[PDB]
């Protein structure tokens, strides 16, 4: 229900514990996992949308690793984002 | 190869069925998504962590900031739009 | 056709030519096939040559090798490593009709290649272009030809990983029953084939898990009834000793399948756990005994008196899967109780797995850098030893008190058994001491806390004396001696004064060059631990007499090692400098020349430069060091800043400036002529002549430090031309705000301008306007938040000191707009206020907005009122994730004062959430904002302001009144 009242599919609870269980900080607000979870969820929706778009553009019904690859590279911002994160 | 710690597959799958309800995802593609989500988390958790000293207490402000240090252009704007909408409904 | 039959004879001729000893025929055949590759039926002919069972093996082998590579590179035009031409629909149909029969081939190498090619095709063609592939492979399994099942199973491993939720309802019910037959018929099918059956089970289960936890009713109908039969078969197979029907790799796959079911279908396997746990426990303990005999204490040089047909492959990977199974139980709210109950025995066997192996001894002795890297707490290495240690840290974090009592009982037993082993003449008895000391030190906080509060039975003083101290005076292995120095430093809090004296003495002895590198490295870590713990405890007095010998030991070690050992010595040298400032000052004459030499020698390495910088910082903060070190360090920094940019390594100059800034920031004015007449000009000149953004920014922060610390001396200094210090600051402020250069040149200029205005400003007062015009022109170019915040903060500061002149000035020019510059500043400021970061920068901006709002109301300053800005984006709550594409397929404009009121309410929200988890510094922002809003809500203007607030903003106001 914690993710449900945040309108999120991704798990606010588990994100909260991953933050606490890490040597990141010694205090974390209830609003941090909510925000971060929505961001993680927003990014996967953006990648899945473009990767599924590419799969649909080849009249395929399954996303495969090449479709994720095309979605990222053929989008300037997602390409820019994945270079700094890798 | 210690303990790609978390498994977000079931949640990646839910989000997939909202943007493309009739499209599937293969095992290797899902594993890549899970690695990606795990990486973006550890990077936002690195910036938002080092920044808590410039401001040691992480909240919706310091991950929103680390989200803008890291995301470029519209990805950063929409991310903050989806993030702030979550916290708003979460506190309603 | 006749041309295809001749193009195939050409292929055969080229293949036979590639298989010839005469290099001429092979070099020609190479150029030939470079052209045949572009033929339409190239792959078709290769497919025929490979599948037909009567051809020559040397041809079939070759056609299959090239067939695999052809399909990998030509089958899909959207492939990454695509090579034209794309296989035509005509050719694909033929090749798809052709290869399946080749999976029945008697020869293994050919059957495997045919299978690899079939999997490559299915990746692209299933289910749209090859709808019959699944029904086709199932036929091969049940045919009865054992070559058909080997080929089909080798394809089904990859195929099932291609199946999605859409097709799984049609694949899982069919294939899993056949995987059960193959898995349980150990007398018919080989180990590798039954192992592939487990792979396919685990793959289907992962997919079914995704579907089930989205919409319940997918796991009852597809796998749950067969989970019972499989789990039962898995536990039966886990008890099979290595032989004709089982080996480590196979047992690993079974265990991973069981672990996958525990993580994905826990509620459904509660009924079977009573059977699984004892069996995996037998696997855990037996594998420990086998690991210790075959890895830990195995000497390769010993010849067996009796030969065996021995293959024990992938045993290390089985061990890992055992730990993973335990982690799975630990991560379940219902199953973790069984680990908690088993901690004494579990931790006993964990310690066996943690022992140093003979191979590890070989590597670490040969490469001390690996020793530093492998034995770091944040190491990326993954070994049985490290994995075992991680499992210990997990149970110790989840069951703090039960782990302390369990680890005490485990170590006590191990040490008892180790005394017996030692008296039997066994050389490697010490490995149990080393592993116990490692274990206890890894979780030192829970052992000392439980011993202090008398919760556990453990002779701490006996452990320190009879194990740790005793082993320091033994000569059995440098890795025992080194582990003891480390372990002692972890238990500093539990040591008697007599012990801390002996252990510090032993640590200094551990540094000397007569010791092997691992010992000296261990001693360095130990010294770091002592300095860190005795500072926190305010007990550094016991450490003071050892500092002279420690310092000499660290400096001497740095002269013999580079790379990671040196970084460790530099980190430890730095913390040593913070123990006794009196001592550090008396040893400045050697610390500072040493650090400078390191700084320059490894000038190409930023990690060392930053560590050198950390030491310089600690010296700069000690008054008695400043004079002597500056005469030493400043000439070297100046040398760096005047050196040509293309000739010194990247970042050295920027770090040199930061070191200088730290000196200036910490020296009380007046500053030496060394800092004013040599350093200040060099840094100003370096900043004005550099093309590097990092140097420029640091240069400005350095001049800002000069202006902030000793404005008088900056003014009274002149060059030969008459230009004074404030002249150079102005020129730098000009270059940083230059709209023609990068945006980032102004990333920190805001601080310089604000400090310059705060200190001088009046002095050369016409310049102020020229700077503000430059700021505005720079904001037009700037797009990044950090830069914009730096600039906008200049005007935010002026709101507190020159509110009316600011509004007057900003309304007096258009700026880079067709509107008053005041419209431009407030438009950019209000649209970014919600992103500003900084506790200080937040207060300045927050109350500045309150004062802008308070002035625009108490007065009728229509320069503020008449302005309109962006307000909010109106989004629906019953819509999913708003992606960028959803934003182009579809913002309010409101009075400035309304937008400002909202930003203030937002700053209150963020400050409330942060707590619930200029001299303005001391004001409680939450109290001030709370005070401002309550008084604001009662003014008559609030009536129409409230109507503009949204639900979330109104909620925040009800929280306060």
Author numbering:
A (entry chain B): 17 to 102
B (entry chain C): 26 to 28, 31 to 82, 85 to 121
C (entry chain A): 15 to 904, 908 to 934, 997 to 1040
Can I see the authors' text?
Eukaryotic chromatin is organized into nucleosomes, which are structural and functional units that are composed of 147 base pairs of DNA wrapped around two H3-H4 dimers and two H2A-H2B dimers. Despite their small sizes, histones do not diffuse into the nucleus but are transported by nuclear import receptors of the Karyopherin-β family termed importins. Imp9, the human homolog of Kap114, was previously shown to bind and import H2A-H2B. Here, we solved the crystal structure of Imp9 bound to the full-length H2A-H2B dimer to understand how histones are recognized for nuclear import.
Similar cytoplasmic localization of Imp9 was reported in the Human Protein Atlas. To understand how Imp9 recognizes histones for nuclear import, we solved the crystal structure of human Imp9 bound to full-length X. laevis H2A-H2B (dissociation constant, KD = 30 nM) by single wavelength anomalous dispersion to 2.7 Å resolution. Imp9 is made up of twenty tandem HEAT repeats, each containing two antiparallel helices A and B that line the convex and concave surfaces of superhelical-shaped protein, respectively. The concave surface of Imp9 is mostly acidic, with a few small basic patches. This charged concave surface of Imp9 wraps around H2A-H2B, burying 1352 Å2 (26% of the H2A-H2B surface) at three distinct interfaces 1–3. The N- and C-terminal HEAT repeats of Imp9 (Interfaces 1 and 3) clamp the histone-fold domain while the inner surface of central HEAT repeats 7–8 (Interface 2) interacts with a five-residue segment of the H2B N-terminal tail. Interface 1 on the histones involves α2-L2-α3 of H2A and α1-L1-α2 of H2B, which constitute a significant portion of the basic DNA-binding surface found in nucleosomes. A basic patch formed by the Imp9 H18-19loop and nearby helices complement an acidic surface on the histones formed by residues from H2A helices α2 and αC, and the C-terminal half of H2B that comprises α2-α3-αC. Removal of the H18-19loop reduced the affinity 15-fold (KD = 450 nM). A large portion of the Imp9 interface on H2A-H2B overlaps with the DNA-binding and H3-H4-binding interfaces used in nucleosomes. The way the Imp9 solenoid wraps around H2A-H2B leaves the predicted N-terminal Ran-binding site of Imp9 accessible and ready to bind RanGTP.
